[PDB]
């Protein structure tokens, strides 16, 4: 599909521990539907490289669904981005 408007995301459920060593989150999108979600994460101070290990394959906002995202992050101080919506994520070491 087309790329979801980076300015039209809000947190329905902010990033949180899943209980099975992943990070889960849910967003509400307010642009055209359906669309394909740009999601990424950066190690603080290094915005060039996406450190997110996405488990959710091809995350997509559907007309009546979508917005759940599951990922894994390297230890340290990270920032998660869904479009331009952001949330800090400290990832505990192994």
């Amino acid at each position: 599909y087309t790329m979801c408007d980076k300015t039209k995301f809000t947190w329905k459920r902010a990033p949180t521990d899943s209980g099975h060593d992943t990070v889960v989150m849910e967003v509400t999108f307010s642009g055209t539907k359906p669309c394909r979600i740009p999601v990424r994460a950066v190690a603080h101070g290094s915005p060039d490289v996406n450190v997110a290990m996405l488990i959710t394959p091809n995350p997509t906002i559907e007309n009546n669904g979508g917005g759940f995202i599951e990922m894994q992050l390297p230890p340290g101080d990270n920032i998660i981005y869904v479009g331009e919506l952001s949330h800090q994520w400290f990832q505990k070491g192994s």
């Epitope: 790329m3 300015t7 039209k8 995301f9 307010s30 642009g31 359906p34 007309n63 331009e84």
Partner: antibody, heavy 120, light 108 residues
Framework: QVQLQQSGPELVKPGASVKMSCKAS????????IGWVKQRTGQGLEWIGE????????YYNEKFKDKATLTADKSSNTAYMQLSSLTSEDSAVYFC?????????????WGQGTTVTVSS | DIELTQSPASLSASVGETVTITCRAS??????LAWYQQKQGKSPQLLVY???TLADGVPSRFSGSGSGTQYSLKINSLQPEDFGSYYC??????????FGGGTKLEIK
């Protein structure tokens, strides 16, 4: 050049419904949002809602969800707003305006407005 | 919802002078603030988007600034066509895309 041509003024009874149109020309219709804005005489602007003509996706201001219905016709490059159960609080100028689908951060051209007057 | 509070409500100035009006957001809108001008009995005209970018055709005496929740529109060297009402609007994250209450700029 980009033009949004709106339909003519309506003078109607309380309880009637009106359907107004916004015909787009000068661009590709389905690449742009059409939003709708209300303005009472001497007062400010209020966002009613918007439609993405390419996908049919709509968004409504909670205050207008039982009042406005937004539709679009790709073949005629036209957006429509229907207002139901009109009261004197609905008397206002209604604008349509254009935003960019996929990076919607402004209403960048505006129609000339359609005046709806509810009267006895 | 995000509320936009515009200030001053009205002001009177003379051609050639400088004026500044502001729009305060109740929450972070990430600079996604648009400014419009509307003259008496006319349609609003886009002046500024993303808080500092002038729209096509807008002369350089207009300038937008601001961030977080406080934004400013500055008009240098006022011209007769600059008079009217000015509105701000935000497009961050989730509707409603609310407008500020408007500022009325009129001749002295």
């Amino acid at each position: 050049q980009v033009q949004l041509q709106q339909s003519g003024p309506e003078l109607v009874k309380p309880g009637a419904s009106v359907k107004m149109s916004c015909k787009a020309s000068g661009y590709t219709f389905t690449d742009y949002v059409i939003g709708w804005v209300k303005q009472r005489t001497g007062q400010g602007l209020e966002w009613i809602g918007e439609i993405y003509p390419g996908s049919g996706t709509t968004y409504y201001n909670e205050k207008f969800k039982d009042k406005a219905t937004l539709t679009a016709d790709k073949s005629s490059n036209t957006a429509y707003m229907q207002l139901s159960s009109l009261t004197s609080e609905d008397s206002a100028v209604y604008f349509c305006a254009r935003g960019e689908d996929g990076y919607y951060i402004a209403l960048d051209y505006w129609g000339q407005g359609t005046t709806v007057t509810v009267s006895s | 919802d995000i509320e936009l509070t515009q200030s001053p409500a009205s002001l009177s100035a003379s051609v050639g002078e400088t004026v500044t009006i502001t729009c305060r957001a109740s929450g972070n809108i990430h600079n996604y603030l648009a400014w419009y001008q509307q003259k008496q009995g006319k349609s609003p005209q886009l002046l500024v988007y993303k808080a500092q970018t002038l729209a096509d055709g807008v002369p350089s005496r207009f300038s937008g600034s601001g961030s977080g929740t406080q934004y400013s529109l500055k008009i240098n060297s006022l011209q007769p066509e600059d008079f009217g009402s000015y509105y701000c609007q935000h497009f961050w994250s989730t509707p409603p895309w609310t407008f500020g209450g408007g500022t009325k700029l009129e001749i002295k």
